[PDB]
Amino acid sequence: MQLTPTFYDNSCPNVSNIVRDTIVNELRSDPRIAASILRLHFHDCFVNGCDASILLDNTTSFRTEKDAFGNANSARGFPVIDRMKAAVESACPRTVSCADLLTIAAQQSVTLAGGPSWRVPLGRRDSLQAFLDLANANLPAPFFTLPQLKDSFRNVGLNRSSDLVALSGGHTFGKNQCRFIMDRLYNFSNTGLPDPTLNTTYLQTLRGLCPLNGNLSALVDMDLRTPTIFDNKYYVNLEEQKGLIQSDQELFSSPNATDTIPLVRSFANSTQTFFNAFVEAMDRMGNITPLTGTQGQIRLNCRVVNS
Amino acid sequence: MQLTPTFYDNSCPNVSNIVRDTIVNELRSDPRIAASILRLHFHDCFVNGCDASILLDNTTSFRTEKDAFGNANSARGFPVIDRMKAAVESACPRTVSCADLLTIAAQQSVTLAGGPSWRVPLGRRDSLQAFLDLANANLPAPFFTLPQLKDSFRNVGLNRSSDLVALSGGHTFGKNQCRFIMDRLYNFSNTGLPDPTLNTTYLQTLRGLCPLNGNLSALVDMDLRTPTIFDNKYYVNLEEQKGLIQSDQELFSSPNATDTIPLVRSFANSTQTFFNAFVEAMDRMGNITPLTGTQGQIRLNCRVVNS
Ligand code: HEM
Ligand code: HEM
Ligand SMILES: O=C(NO)c1ccccc1
Ligand SMILES: O=C(NO)c1ccccc1
Ligand SMILES: [Ca+2]
Ligand SMILES: [Ca+2]
Ligand SMILES: [Ca+2]
Ligand SMILES: [Ca+2]
């Protein structure tokens, strides 16, 4: 079955508003939640498709993806997801899947942060288990080279350069722990020297935030220009060699960036072009091997499989 | 209202078995769960009493105690608690509180680990909010001195030396992160030397497990003799200066341990005496300012307050 943005127009016409309202309230106490939610959706889709497998808690039959390298002590916002599911179950019992809920939540998060507004295709159903080992192999790491980042995306069906460049624009807001950039700051590639593609003045600022013997869990803004606004500033930073993580800067400075540089230049100089591309890439990501029809179920509680 | 072990004998006579069955199944995949659960009960009781406040997830009206120093990236087993609550709600809808469930789970965990078996007083109800700031002040820290550990316990009503010594016997099983003993190993009290009350041969073993530049999250066994069995070996270790954390060894080596040494000697040489004392101390802890009668509620989902 093909996903359609009209899937709940009859069964639960107000699911979008309920989702938006929940995030709006949460943003008041946690300005970072919008970024956290968009990330949860991405990590859901890259492991067996957008099937809400990442939302399952540990059981005796399978381990949670929340323990995966990249998720463990990093991914957050789960209780917030619980809140909107409860509110939706009240208005539309056993109607909206967690997989779709997380998808709408990601879109609303982007819009609420100043990004584009669009209707996401719906109709996905929830998985009956979690895939930890798969998550440990499918999620891209910040130390990956450009070709490696390309392989990671192609591995799940996003084989276009625009997919990688556009979706990476998700780093236009949100935070990153010092631990993931320590090497770029003090000893890159076993050279004992910092990453040469990192702007020197910016290097001083980062070293101040992430000292050699400091807290590795200390958080830094992904986008130094507009830390909480979803815009195209992420690309301007790359042109100035101010991409925070290795995977960010490689989009512009890697020797294999022949095909990505033009997209960065384009996105850095046109919000419309970037927004159009981001929406297209997002819908493509949301279409990775979804469970539909009678496959999977409509979870009542996103943390556990239905009895 | 006074707590009574017969509280559910009519309303939900099989709650004990349902709780035991859940832990037995979990132990198969996670041998540490018994220790984790007993600890969750202790951290519940020390903050506003055993009211299941520690089980509440973050909300926009109050912050979760799961973020407290001592709980954050340390406390675990929450999904397991979710599992037994679901099973109990199926057999006895809206009957057993999370506060009581966590209490029975703690007792069964001790028994299943080889400890004593007894009927816990019941009748507690669930809180309507969590107390993070209170948790940050009420939970004892591993770097506390003997008098400080005594003040911490007296602060919640456990003003007897036996309470401190007996309950500390909970370290007869379970794990501890390297981060909490690094100072005893390499630089105790700003002296640049290890803790003199730590056995030197054991110090070598620990330094091997917790290297100066190693993983601070690496886990070490609390009891080097019988790491997973609930017995009195914890006290024998203290006599040999092999207590893992500072608060452990101080029970035997502190200059203020005049009143605790005799209890340690006694408990180290008689399982019966220790078990009797542990059960008495546990029931006293389980009686810290409970919510009863019409106070609080019977939570349907331990993570959230009833609508
Ligand atoms: C190209 C490969 C990617 C890599 C290697 C990567 C790596 C990372 C790293 C290291 C962090 C910080 C984690 C932490 O400090 O706990 C992070 C955060 C984030 N990423 Fe990515 N990421 C990638 C792609 C994406 C994509 C495609 C999106 C979504 C469109 C995304 C959205 C986010 C957001 C919004 C945050 C901040 C989350 C928060 O603050 O809670 N990332 N990413
Ligand atoms: C006297 C003050 C106490 C201090 C300062 C203290 C401190 C600690 C520390 C540092 C850990 C390791 C945490 C980690 O590595 O994440 C721990 C674990 C543990 N504690 Fe205590 N504790 C105390 C009292 C108690 C009491 C009274 C009980 C319950 C009767 C208890 C039961 C446990 C258990 C079973 C574990 C292991 C948990 C697991 O492996 O998941 N503790 N404690
Ligand atoms: O966000 C990640 N992958 O998308 C990630 C984060 C840190 C370590 C490994 C992977
Ligand atoms: O277990 C604790 N308190 O009981 C604890 C653990 C580490 C740091 C602070 C407190
Ligand atoms: Ca998934
Ligand atoms: Ca931005
Ligand atoms: Ca409590
Ligand atoms: Ca033992």
PDB file of C-alpha atoms in Angstrom, chain A residues 2 5 21 39 43 60 64 68 77-78 96 98 115 154 157 163 167 174 181 190 222 253 300:
ATOM      1  CA  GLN A   2       1.178   3.512  -0.868  1.00  0.00           C
ATOM      2  CA  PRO A   5      -1.072  12.403   3.408  1.00  0.00           C
ATOM      3  CA  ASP A  21      -0.130  21.466  20.543  1.00  0.00           C
ATOM      4  CA  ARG A  39      16.362  13.138  15.150  1.00  0.00           C
ATOM      5  CA  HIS A  43      17.015   7.124  13.588  1.00  0.00           C
ATOM      6  CA  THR A  60      13.230 -10.534  27.296  1.00  0.00           C
ATOM      7  CA  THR A  64      16.014  -1.918  22.654  1.00  0.00           C
ATOM      8  CA  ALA A  68      22.645   1.493  20.240  1.00  0.00           C
ATOM      9  CA  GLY A  77      12.208  13.031  23.998  1.00  0.00           C
ATOM     10  CA  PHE A  78      10.558   9.663  24.587  1.00  0.00           C
ATOM     11  CA  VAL A  96      -2.863   6.350  14.672  1.00  0.00           C
ATOM     12  CA  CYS A  98       3.435   5.356  16.628  1.00  0.00           C
ATOM     13  CA  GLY A 115      11.167  25.543   8.706  1.00  0.00           C
ATOM     14  CA  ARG A 154      22.467   4.463  -0.296  1.00  0.00           C
ATOM     15  CA  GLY A 157      17.595   3.627  -0.498  1.00  0.00           C
ATOM     16  CA  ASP A 163      19.355  13.334  -0.011  1.00  0.00           C
ATOM     17  CA  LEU A 167      18.918  15.882   5.254  1.00  0.00           C
ATOM     18  CA  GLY A 174      20.037  21.068  18.092  1.00  0.00           C
ATOM     19  CA  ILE A 181      34.498  16.493  18.291  1.00  0.00           C
ATOM     20  CA  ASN A 190      46.442  10.223  15.049  1.00  0.00           C
ATOM     21  CA  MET A 222      25.265  22.453  15.952  1.00  0.00           C
ATOM     22  CA  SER A 253      35.835  20.079   2.210  1.00  0.00           C
ATOM     23  CA  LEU A 300      -1.592   1.332  21.923  1.00  0.00           C
TER      24      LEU A 300
END
